[PDB]
Amino acid sequence: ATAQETDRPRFSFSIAAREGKARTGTIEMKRGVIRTPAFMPVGTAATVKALKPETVRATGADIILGNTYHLMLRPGAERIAKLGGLHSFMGWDRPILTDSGGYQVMSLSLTKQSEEGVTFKSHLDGSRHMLSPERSIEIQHLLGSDIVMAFDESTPYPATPSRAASSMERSMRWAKRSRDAFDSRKEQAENAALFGIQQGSVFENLRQQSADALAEIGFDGYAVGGLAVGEGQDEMFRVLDFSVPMLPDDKPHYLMGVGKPDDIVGAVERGIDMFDSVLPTRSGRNGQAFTWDGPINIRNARFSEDLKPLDSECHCAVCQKWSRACIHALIRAGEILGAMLMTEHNIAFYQQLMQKIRDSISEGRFSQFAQDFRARYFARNS
Amino acid sequence: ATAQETDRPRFSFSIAAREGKARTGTIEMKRGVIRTPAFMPVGTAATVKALKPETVRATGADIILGNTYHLMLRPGAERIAKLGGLHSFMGWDRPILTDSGGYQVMSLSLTKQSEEGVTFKSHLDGSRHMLSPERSIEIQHLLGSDIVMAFDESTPYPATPSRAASSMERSMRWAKRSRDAFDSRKEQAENAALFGIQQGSVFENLRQQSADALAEIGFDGYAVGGLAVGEGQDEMFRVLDFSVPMLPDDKPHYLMGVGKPDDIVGAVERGIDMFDSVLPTRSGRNGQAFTWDGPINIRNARFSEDLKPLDSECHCAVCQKWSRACIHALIRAGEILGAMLMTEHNIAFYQQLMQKIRDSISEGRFSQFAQDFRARYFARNS
Ligand SMILES: [Zn+2]
Ligand SMILES: [Zn+2]
């Protein structure tokens, strides 16, 4: 029997190779295989400005992220389910990870907050919505996503040691509630996976408390929450240094909302397996391209006659055809094609970064790759 | 009082300067002034592939052409009138010339033909339509066009001396009928103009017979028909040599469906004041650009790194920004913007040709311009 004819497991994480704290391997799921370390582009509605799903796939993405908060405001979770689920809605038939909605409640919406959950006003039309461990898992079930995030409590940066601890403890009680809600639905529990989220801010003892609590409940994967919220890379790396080793070794480790290319490399050096970020898309819409020599602003006059591709080594479809000069022309003209090409290149560049990370770990030369990568990225000889 | 506040005449042709048989001047109409010699781009439906009317105007066009045959098949003349007329339909508030429909009947449609008129089947849906001097003028009235073409009979190329003569005589009887139908409608006769069409193929005596007949009826302008239908430039110029002097000197002379840039220059040398052609649009959609060094095929590999504009001297909006290299990229990608840019440039190049013709006649150096133009256009040092 071929691989195509073979039964696919619900969730199987295998580690193929290690170098220090870094790992490379695969997550097998029913909708496909995810190569790790993995970068997940953030999915959106299919507007004139969004890439086609076949384009996103061709950049190398194995899985994309859906924002539960935005999908529950428009067109709503029940509507997405009636349309066949999020995979049908987005035209993406591979795995999808959904966040819980809890972060955007804090950052974008808030009527009531308690141990029960939260009620909040749409930032769009003032309507009231409710989220809780139970409602968040139910909505992610309606979306049909493959990896479900537990609902937790975010504490804004920077947080009092007092605020850090009470928020982490509530998040751990909410993590058990998320577990039980997920397990209550046979359709979800047999076909999807559930990740828990470690909290504790910068405090090693709180982080250990959270890790032990999550490990006692048991999850398919573990995210490190509370980072990439304003703390700077130095602090972020310091927290990762002691937080990641606390999580179960044989499950994936997910750093949510990270990030810049150098953030990703250093986080993999510290044991992270999964990443998401809007940065390649946001940068692409704003005329900024990622390259191995650092970011470039394509509107700069120096690019108007530059016949080289955006990046000298990138093998994305954009760089195999389009010059800096012509992408500069399109962006300066306000032509949507310009932003589309930048965005495709940026997402593909992120995937090629992940592939170089995976390859170098497999070959036992990742520590040297990370050194070579930083020297060149920060030299900015673009 | 300013020019903007002053009464505009129905149709006033003034000749400002002459060099040999060539003339430059103006046609004043109620919807604006037409600089002559004039090139009229052919207008179409507002599809994703059509230029915006403000873009067509900005290329220098003072008047555009509407194809009566196509407009009467879709959406139909009565529909265009209900929508406010052709100017409202097309978003073009300056003068419009409509042809009679008779040429496309021959070339595209034919159920019945007699001295009465013709009945024919749509090449689209088989429906039956009728045209005659009277019906053609009525339809052009429904369209609201500013310059109306008499309905004549085309004889396909090459035509027997027998066919040439009977067709010209019928066309002259149909020219009187067109005159009387036009004059029957106060709204049309007070606000629009009517052109007659000389026929006679290559036979000088037939052409003189036609000219005398048209001059006896009396028209606001006179077209030279029966050319640009396969005869080649040598023959075309030979016929123009004796045909144009037969027409009234103090009225505009219109060569329908011409043509290539060198055709236009030589026809102005022979006394033609007005031109139309689909060539700038057809070429633009097919990846061909007109330049002072001859046409170029932008898909050619030699243009992939050429940072020069399409033409070295053209001051159209495309050439003030876009390189050959980037228009090559767009065309090779099948991006509609590529064809749009080529088409805008081609129409603007035609207008800049007409402006150089007008300027050189005014300065008494048109004969030298025509010599300089041919030497460079045919050398093809692009
Ligand atoms: Zn690229
Ligand atoms: Zn141009």
- In three-state form (DSSP H/G/I as H, E/B as E, the rest C), the secondary structure along chain A is CCHHHCCCCCEEEEEEEEECCEEEEEEEECCEEEEECEEEEECCCCCCCCCCHHHHHHCCCCCEEECHHHHHHCCCHHHHHHCCCHHHHHCCCCCEEECCCHHHHHHHCCCEEECCEEEEECCCCCCEEEECHHHHHHHHHHHCCCEEECCCCCCCCCCCHHHHHHHHHHHHHHHHHHHHHHHHCHHHHHHCEEEEEECCCCCHHHHHHHHHHHHHHCCCEEEECCCCCCCCHHHHHHHHHHHHHHCCCCCCEEECCCCCHHHHHHHHCCCCCEEEECHHHHHHHCCEECCCCCCEECCCHHHCCCCCCCCCCCCCCCCCCCCHHHHHHHHHCCCHHHHHHHHHHHHHHHHHHHHHHHHHHHCCCHHHHHHHHHHHHHHCCC
Q: Which residue of A has its CA nearest to B330?
A: A326
How many CB atoms sit inside 10 A of residue B64's CB?
A: 22
Q: B233, B259 in Cβ contact below 8 A? A: no
Beta strand pairing status for B38-41 and B32-36?
A: unpaired
Residues of B whose CB is below 8 A from A337: 335, 337
Rounded distance between C-alpha atoms, residue B128 and residue A359, angstroms:
70
Instruction: Indicate the annotated binding residues of B for Zn(2+).
Output: 314, 316, 319, 345
CA end-to-end span of chain A, whole Å? 49
Which stretch of DSSP H or E encloses residue B224? strand B221-224
Return the residue matching tokens 């993405």.
Answer: A61
Work out whether the CA dihedral B304, B307, B312, B318 comes out positive or negative.
positive
Q: Which residue of A has its CA nearest to B337?
A: A335
Rounded distance between C-alpha atoms, residue B217 and residue B92, angstroms:
31
Do B323 and A323 lie within an 8 Å CB cutoff?
no
Rounded distance between C-alpha atoms, residue B251 and residue B232, angstroms:
27
Q: Is residue B296, in this structure, part of any structural domain at all?
A: no
β-bridge partners, B129: B120
Of B303, B321, B330, which to mutate for an interface test with A (greatest number of A Cβ within 10 Å)?
B330
Structure-determination approach: X-ray
Residues bordering ligand 2, an ion, CB closer than 5 Å:
B 314, 316, 318-319, 345
Candidates B305, B322, B330; nearest CB to A307: B305
Residues whose CB falls within 8 Å of the CB of residue B264, separated by 6 or more in sequence, listed in order: B37, B39, B258, B275, B350, B353, B354, B357
C-alpha distance from B326 to closest chain A C-alpha (Å):
5
Q: Is residue A314, in this structure, part of any structural domain at all?
A: no
Using CA atoms, how far residue B93 sits from A253, B65, B90, in Å, is 65, 13, 8
Q: Is residue B290, in this structure, part of any structural domain at all?
A: no
Amino acid making up residue B272: I
In 3-state terms, what secondary structure has residue B28? strand
Do B323 and A329 lie within an 8 Å CB cutoff?
yes
Residues whose CB falls within 8 Å of the CB of residue A147, separated by 6 or more in sequence, listed in order: A29, A63, A95, A96, A97, A98, A192, A193, A194, A195, A220, A221
Tell me how far the alpha carbon of residue B347 lies from the centroid of ligand 2, in angstroms. Answer: 9
Q: A219, A177 in Cβ contact below 8 A? A: no
Candidates A322, A333, A335; nearest CB to B329: A322
B interface with A, Cβ–Cβ below 8 Å: 305, 307, 321-323, 325-326, 329-330, 333, 335, 337
Do A321 and B307 lie within an 8 Å CB cutoff?
no
Rounded distance between C-alpha atoms, residue A23 and residue A274, angstroms:
11
Residues of A whose CB is below 8 A from B336: none
Tell me how far the alpha carbon of residue B317 lies from the centroid of ligand 2, in angstroms. Answer: 7
How many CB atoms sit inside 10 A of residue B300's CB?
A: 12
Half-sphere exposure of A236 (CA within 13 A, CB side): 26
CA-based R_g, chain A, Å: 21
C-alpha distance from A345 to closest chain B C-alpha (Å):
16
State the maximum Cα–Cα separation within chain B, in Å, rounded to a whole number: 61
Catalytic residue among A146, A276, A306, A311: A276
Rounded distance between C-alpha atoms, residue B45 and residue B92, angstroms:
12
Look at residues B214, B192, B210 and name the one whose alpha carbon lies nearest to residue B201: B210
Q: Which residue of B has its CA nearest to A325?
A: B326
Indicate if A273 belongs to the active site.
no
Task: Give Cα B40 to chain centroid, integer Å.
Answer: 5
Q: A317, B325 in Cβ contact below 8 A? A: no
The DSSP result for B44-61, as a single string, is: ----TTSPPHHHHHHTT-
Token duo for residue A322 = 């389009």
Amino acid making up residue B242: F
Residues bordering ligand 1, an ion, CB closer than 5 Å:
A 314, 316, 318-319, 345
Q: A374, A87 in Cβ contact below 8 A? A: no
Instruction: Identify the burial level of A139 via C-beta atoms within 10 angstroms of its C-beta, where 0-12 means exposed, 13-18 middle and 19 or more buried.
Output: buried
Across the A/B interface, how many CB contacts are shorter than 8 Å? 28
In the sheet that holds A96-98, the strands lie side by side as A38-41, A274-277, A253-255, A221-224, A193-198, A147-149, A96-98, A64-66
Do A325 and B326 lie within an 8 Å CB cutoff?
yes
Residues of B whose CB is below 8 A from A333: 321
Indicate if B99 belongs to the active site.
yes
Rounded distance between C-alpha atoms, residue A34 and residue A31, angstroms:
10
C-alpha distance from B59 to closest chain A C-alpha (Å):
18
Total structural domains within chain B: 1
Tell me how far the alpha carbon of residue B354 lies from the centroid of ligand 2, in angstroms. Answer: 14
Rounded distance between C-alpha atoms, residue A39 and residue A276, angstroms:
6
Candidates B325, B330, B337; nearest CB to A325: B325
Q: What is the total residue count of chain B?
A: 382
Q: Is residue A118, in this structure, part of any structural domain at all?
A: yes
Q: Is residue A338, in this structure, part of any structural domain at all?
A: no
Which stretch of DSSP H or E encloses residue B71? helix B68-73
Instruction: Identify the burial level of B380 via C-beta atoms within 10 angstroms of its C-beta, where 0-12 means exposed, 13-18 middle and 19 or more buried.
Output: exposed
Residues of A whose CB is below 8 A from B335: 337
Tell me how far the alpha carbon of residue B170 lies from the centroid of ligand 1, in angstroms. Answer: 67
Residue A226, annotated as binding a ligand: yes
Token duo for residue A23 = 């790992």
| Backbone φ and ψ of B215, nearest 5° | -65, -30
Q: B238, B327 in Cβ contact below 8 A? A: no
Residues of B whose CB is below 8 A from A329: 321-323, 326
Residues of B whose CB is below 8 A from A322: 329
C-alpha distance from A332 to closest chain B C-alpha (Å):
10
Catalytic residue among B62, B99, B263, B311: B99
Rounded distance between C-alpha atoms, residue A73 and residue A45, angstroms:
12
Supply the range of the domain harboring residue A184.
11-283+346-379
Return the residue matching tokens 């236009």.
Answer: B264
Q: A267, A31 in Cβ contact below 8 A? A: no
Do A335 and B333 lie within an 8 Å CB cutoff?
no
Beta strand pairing status for B32-36 and A147-149?
A: unpaired
The DSSP result for B241-306, as a single string, is: HHHGGGS-TTS-EEETT--SHHHHHHHHTTT--EEEESHHHHHHHTTEE--TT--EETTSGGGTT-
Beta strand pairing status for A64-66 and A38-41?
A: unpaired
Q: Is residue B337, in this structure, part of any structural domain at all?
A: no
Using CA atoms, how far residue A141 sits from A82, A87, A132, A175, A350, in Å, is 13, 12, 14, 16, 29
Whether omega before A75 lies within 30 degrees of 0, making that bond cis, reads yes
Return the residue matching tokens 């998040």.
Answer: A171
Instruction: Indicate the annotated binding residues of B.
Output: 99-103, 152, 199, 226, 314, 316, 319, 345
Tell me how far the alpha carbon of residue A253 lies from the centroid of ligand 1, in angstroms. Answer: 28
Using CA atoms, how far residue A52 sits from A43, A46, B96, B306, in Å, is 10, 8, 42, 31
Rounded distance between C-alpha atoms, residue B104 and residue B96, angstroms:
18
- Resolution to 1 decimal, in Å? 1.7
Tell me how far the alpha carbon of residue A239 lies from the centroid of ligand 2, in angstroms. Answer: 59
Q: Is residue B241, in this structure, part of any structural domain at all?
A: yes
C-alpha distance from A40 to closest chain B C-alpha (Å):
28
Do A321 and B329 lie within an 8 Å CB cutoff?
yes
In 3-state terms, what secondary structure has residue B115? coil
Token duo for residue B76 = 């139909």
Catalytic residue among B220, B263, B276, B311: B276
**How many degrees, rounded to 5, is the angle at CA B152 between CA B62 and CA B182?**
65
Do B335 and A333 lie within an 8 Å CB cutoff?
no
Do B325 and A326 lie within an 8 Å CB cutoff?
yes
Task: Give Cα B290 to chain centroid, integer Å.
Answer: 18
C-alpha distance from B293 to closest chain A C-alpha (Å):
24
Residues of B whose CB is below 8 A from A327: none
Which stretch of DSSP H or E encloses residue B240? helix B233-243
Candidates A307, A321, A335; nearest CB to B337: A335
Tell me how far the alpha carbon of residue A55 lies from the centroid of ligand 1, in angstroms. Answer: 13
Q: Is residue B222, in this structure, part of any structural domain at all?
A: yes
Token duo for residue B162 = 């027998």
Question: Which CATH number characterizes residue B29's domain?
Answer: 3.20.20.105
How many CB atoms sit inside 10 A of residue B368's CB?
A: 12
Residues whose CB falls within 8 Å of the CB of residue A294, separated by 6 or more in sequence, listed in order: A377, A378, A379, A380, A382
State the maximum Cα–Cα separation within chain A, in Å, rounded to a whole number: 61
Token duo for residue B119 = 């009945």
Token duo for residue B198 = 């000389």
How many CB atoms sit inside 10 A of residue A126's CB?
A: 7
Residues of B whose CB is below 8 A from A340: none
